[PDB]
Structures are given as structure tokens and as C-alpha cells.
Amino acid sequence: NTTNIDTLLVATDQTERIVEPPENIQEKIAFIFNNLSQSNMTQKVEELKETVKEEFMPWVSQYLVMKRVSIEPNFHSLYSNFLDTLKNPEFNKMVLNETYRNIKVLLTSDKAAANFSDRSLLKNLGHWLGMITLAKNKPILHTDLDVKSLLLEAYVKGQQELLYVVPFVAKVLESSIRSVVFRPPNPWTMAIMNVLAELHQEHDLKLNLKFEIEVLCKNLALDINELKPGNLLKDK
């Protein structure tokens, strides 16, 4: 399938087992997320509070990130609007950490035994990440995800790793244009852009990755030619 999440499932089955809510609560949560729309969001959010206790919220963040967000990129705005409406800043943090966790499972997974879908899962999680951090004026701390080093490590590893990582980075950075704090010419954003602009100068980078970078620039209203590529790759 194109929505195989086994790679995430397996990695979870080797983590500290958390408290699973009773089936009637699980079922209610699935029903809510299955039937969530813009025109019932208020009603659905209220239902969510009136049914899920505080101790189940870790499970709910795991459900939302692993089972929904990773394979429903078309409803990212909806779940994000859902979080805004829920006004549960401690729930948001669980979702953030679960997002970082699954991202790392993918980034560090053996790319040879990977499912066809794993690239998509990574892109989707990156898109979501950008939406719940940058777009909402929260930083992506390097102690959670160091984007610049990710790019540099990928370039050392080869085309296969770049093929996974570059579209991941682009999906994340897409959200920066919606952030008063992180939009260009924000220094953190531009340092990543400058590394990407340097990759873009590599003659043998696959054309579709060159397009990822050029399209990222267009989305951030950046002139690709106005970027300031360094010499970080020239060591490698």
C-alpha cells in the first residue's frame, strides 16, 4: 500500500508502552477523527473533551500523529485547526514530541528494507511539523531536529538519502512563510535556505530535487539567485 505505516508501528512496539484507553473510548476517538469536518469542528472538539480523560491524551496524540496525520496530508489543515480549537497546550506538546519521534524512526530507518510509502510518510510528517511549529511561531529547536545537519548528513550519504531528506526539509520549511517570527529573512530559515542553495549548485543532483529547492524558494517568495550559498559541501 501507499499508506503502509508498519515502519512506524514496529518502532512503536519497541517503545515504553503507554496507557491504552478502553475500546469504547478508542472507538469514539476514531469516529470523531473519521467524521471531522470544518462544519462540525466546534461540535467535534467539544465531544472530544467531554469523552476523553487527561490520562488518555498521550494515546490520542499517538493515534493522531501515527495513524492519521502521517497518511492524511489532505486533512492537515483540519487537524491543525482542530488543535487550535481544542486549546490544550499540553496536548499540543505531546503531539509535537510524537511528531519528532516518528520523524526520527523514518530518518534513521534502514532505507533498503523500507516500504514504498516511507518517503511519503516522512514528507507528510514534515509538512505537519512545519504546521504545528513554524507556522504557529514556535521554533524547531536543534535539540529536537537539527535541519541543517540533516541536509549535510544526507549529502554525505548519497542520492538515496537526499531523495528522502530534501523533500522532507522542503515540506517543513513551506510553513515558514506564514510565520511573523520565522518568515524570511529570519536567520534560522535563511541558513537552511543557504545550504539548500548550495545543494542546488551540485551538477549531479537529481533534477526533481533541484525542482524541490526551486519550488520551495518560490513558496517562500525568495529569489533563488538572491541566496548566499557557502562552501559547506566542498569539505565533502
Binding site: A30, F31, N34, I71, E72, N74, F75
Partner: peptide, 11 residues
């Protein structure tokens, strides 16, 4: 039907 919508992941 209600069971299905409580058990599946439906986009």
C-alpha cells in the same frame, strides 16, 4: 456501519 466508522482509518 457505526462499528466500521469506529474501527477503520477513513480518509
Amino acid at each position: 456501519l457505526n462499528t466500521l466508522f469506529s474501527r477503520l482509518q477513513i480518509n
